[PDB]
Design an enzyme around this catalytic site. Structure first.
Site, PDB file in Angstrom:
ATOM      1  N   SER A 193      12.148   4.552  -2.212  1.00 52.64           N
ATOM      2  CA  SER A 193      13.271   3.880  -2.840  1.00 52.64           C
ATOM      3  C   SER A 193      14.297   4.907  -3.297  1.00 52.64           C
ATOM      4  O   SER A 193      13.962   6.036  -3.654  1.00 52.64           O
ATOM      5  CB  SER A 193      12.767   3.051  -4.026  1.00 52.64           C
ATOM      6  OG  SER A 193      13.830   2.494  -4.792  1.00 52.64           O
TER       7      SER A 193
ATOM      8  N   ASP B 183      -3.031  -8.724   2.457  1.00 50.86           N
ATOM      9  CA  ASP B 183      -2.946  -7.493   1.669  1.00 50.86           C
ATOM     10  C   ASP B 183      -2.379  -6.359   2.520  1.00 50.86           C
ATOM     11  O   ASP B 183      -3.115  -5.724   3.282  1.00 50.86           O
ATOM     12  CB  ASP B 183      -4.330  -7.116   1.146  1.00 50.86           C
ATOM     13  CG  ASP B 183      -4.327  -5.854   0.313  1.00 50.86           C
ATOM     14  OD1 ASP B 183      -3.228  -5.393  -0.053  1.00 50.86           O
ATOM     15  OD2 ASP B 183      -5.438  -5.342   0.021  1.00 50.86           O
TER      16      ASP B 183
END
Length: 330
Positions: free
Chosen positions: A199, A35
């Site tokens: 992004s 994770d």
């Protein structure tokens, strides 16, 4: 040193991925959920409330000659999906894919919430976010990667998750045969303890690319892709009959649909998520309403590039002095 371990989807939907981890002496192999959105290595154990164990493999520290109780240390964690666990702490030897750390904090669960009990395939979590998020008190502990870093050939790990197929976590090296083209690296903020990046935009299907900054986290422990409501609405508007359902808890679409792809930007590079990766199947057994793999982050407080996005790429988690993230197509 290096390590290399295969990671395998837990079910036919890729709801999560499990990776075998050796703990203790003699080794006890548990299948952990790696994770990159958390920083605790915790396991089902001989200390876990018996009624909260239902098929998981447990760590028994009393059977490990290298286990030592970390005196006074406790841990307690709550995840973004509302699940939680807590307990005490041992140090022990932990190996992943041939890479060994001695003295790793292994957090032994005394209590786990119902969603963990109900998932017999996940024996615990191995956190790979920054150690500043580790919950052990009163002395915070380091992640497996933080403990291994200095010994690694290069201070990196990579995630290569499969679509409906096994993939690989590598530590200490970049497998140049595992991706196509080049790896595009992008800046990371560690201010929230995550692999947080920005992004450069998105496209839906064959549509034009929209240049827009989307701050979010690279999180292997989250199944879906969670993005701003504007972006998610633009995606699902291209699917006839798709709608946001308050009763189901997100966007659903007709199971008869063919989904468009979704592209996200990494600098000037582009990662394409095929439409099929966005199908999470019937909302309930036998339903013709299917659950979408791109969902709004509006209720979270952060955008999450979860498995839906990451499995479309070869992802480098660069733990150099100034960390960065790398993405390649594959």
């Amino acid at each position: 040193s290096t390590g290399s371990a295969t990671t395998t989807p837990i079910d036919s939907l890729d709801d999560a991925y499990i990776t075998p981890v050796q703990i203790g002496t003699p080794a006890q192999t548990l299948n952990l959920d790696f994770d990159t959105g958390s920083s605790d290595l915790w396991v089902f154990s001989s200390e876990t409330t018996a009624s909260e164990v239902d098929g998981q493999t447990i760590y028994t520290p009393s059977k490990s000659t290298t286990a030592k109780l970390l005196s006074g240390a406790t841990w307690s964690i709550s995840y973004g999906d509302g699940s939680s666990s807590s307990g005490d702490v041992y140090t022990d030897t932990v190996s992943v894919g041939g890479l060994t750390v001695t003295g790793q904090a292994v957090e032994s669960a005394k209590k786990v919430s119902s969603s963990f009990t109900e998932d017999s395939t996940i024996d615990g979590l191995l956190g790979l976010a920054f150690s500043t998020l580790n919950t052990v008190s009163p002395t915070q502990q380091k992640t497996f990667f933080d403990n291994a870093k200095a010994s690694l050939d290069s201070p990196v790990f990579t995630a290569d998750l499969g679509y409906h197929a096994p993939g690989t976590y590598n530590f200490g090296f970049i497998d140049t045969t595992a991706y196509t083209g080049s790896i595009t690296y992008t800046a990371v903020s560690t201010k929230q303890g995550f692999w947080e990046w920005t992004s450069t935009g998105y496209a839906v299907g064959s549509g034009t690319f929209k240049s827009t900054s989307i701050d979010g986290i690279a999180d292997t422990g989250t199944t879906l892709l969670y993005l701003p409501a504007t972006v998610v609405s633009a995606y699902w508007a291209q699917v006839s009959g798709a709608k946001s359902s308050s009763s189901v808890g997100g966007y659903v679409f007709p199971c008869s649909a063919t989904l468009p792809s979704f592209t996200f930007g990494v600098g000037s590079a582009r990662i394409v998520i095929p439409g099929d990766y966005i199908d999470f199947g019937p909302i309930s057994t036998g339903s013709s309403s299917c659950f979408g793999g791109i969902q709004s982050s509006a209720g979270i407080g952060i955008n999450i590039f979860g498995d839906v996005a990451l499995k479309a790429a070869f992802v480098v988690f660069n733990g150099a002095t100034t960390p960065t993230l790398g993405f390649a197509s594959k």
